Amino acid sequence: ATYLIGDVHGCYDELIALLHKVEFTPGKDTLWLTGDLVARGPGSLDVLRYVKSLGDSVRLVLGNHDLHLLAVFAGISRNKPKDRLTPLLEAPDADELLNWLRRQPLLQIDEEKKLVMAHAGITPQWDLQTAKECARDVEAVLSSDSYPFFLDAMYGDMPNNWSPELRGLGRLRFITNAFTRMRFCFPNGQLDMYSKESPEEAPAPLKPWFAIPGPVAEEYSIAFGHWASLEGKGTPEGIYALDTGCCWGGTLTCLRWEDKQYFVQPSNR
């Protein structure tokens, strides 16, 4: 069976309880994870160890908090105490875990399931080939010996409009923001980098990225996490918002793909 789980954010106990509820069995089942495995919750180290141990039985995409952890690890950014990353950073296998994590994709595609996953979703300005190429570019820099330079360069909110003519730092920054930070779009699909509220509370003319018709969403289902204030609600058919805010005292949500059946684990906080 195929299980998809939203942002874990170090909530290892809830993740294990949820997978035990569905009797997740590596070798018979596959787990998709929307990213943001780490930070806020207490168990980022245990989560990383477990997900890495799954190997071919897990299909991950990186989120903004995974990238921030990599920035902290590489001395690019400062550790925030509230992220609760110090046990992971000081672990004896920290190097092994983080060198694995930085080699993971930003985008997962399964053609037989007609299913696409990325942390924040797929911007309506991309078709499938463009999204594939952008994922490959950013993954290439993240898995290279020089990834700290990219991590340093990724921070920023512009440009917010895709063009195939984008080059260098702006192209890479846009790719990263589209895959890991996107929530609202302008009518022309350009990214807004400030609003984090629910679609109902957003000011005009901002609308969810999935409310703008795009070539990928027209042909594929799209699963994503990231947008906790969405609360997994209000999406059109074929759009699956899996982040229900476990680390925030909400819930950890698991979707079984074969029957679109939902399983929910309450936050322990």
Ligand X SMILES: Nc1nc(=O)c2ncn([C@@H]3O[C@H](COP(=O)(O)OP(=O)(O)OP(=O)(O)OP(=O)(O)O)[C@@H](O)[C@H]3O)c2[nH]1
| Binds ligand X by CB under 6 A, chosen from 229, 238, 256, 267 | 229
Least separation in angstroms between CB 76 and ligand X: 16
Q: Answer whether 264's CB lies under 8 Å from 231's CB.
A: no
202 is a contact residue toward ligand X (CB under 6 A): no
Distances (CA, A) of 203 to 123, 181, 184, 186: 19, 18, 10, 11
Instruction: Name residues whose C-beta falls within 8 Å of residue 194's C-beta, 6 or more positions apart in sequence.
Output: 157
Q: Which is nearer to ligand X, 199 or 214 (CB)?
A: 199
Contact pattern from residue 7 through residue 26 relative to Mn ion, giving x for each residue in contact according to CB under 5 A and a dash for the rest: x-------------------
101 is a contact residue toward ligand X (CB under 6 A): no
| Binds ligand X by CB under 6 A, chosen from 196, 211, 238, 267 | 196
Least separation in angstroms between CB 112 and ligand X: 30
Question: Which entry of ligand X, Mn ion, none binds 181, CB below 5 to 8 A by partner kind?
Answer: ligand X
Instruction: Name residues whose C-beta falls within 8 Å of residue 198's C-beta, 6 or more positions apart in sequence.
Output: 229, 230, 231, 234
Beta bridge partners of 118: 107
Q: How far is CA 152 from the centre of its chain?
A: 19
173 is a contact residue toward ligand X (CB under 6 A): no
Q: List, as one string, the DSSP characters of 158-205.
A: ---S--TT--HHHHHHHHHHHHHT--EE-TT-PBPSS--S-GGGSPTT
Least separation in angstroms between CB 262 and ligand X: 18
| Binds ligand X by CB under 6 A, chosen from 60, 245, 246, 265 | 245
| Residues lying near Mn ion in the complex (CB under 5 A) | 7, 36, 63-64, 226
| Residues lying near ligand X in the complex (CB under 6 A) | 36, 64-65, 181, 196-198, 226-229, 231, 245, 248
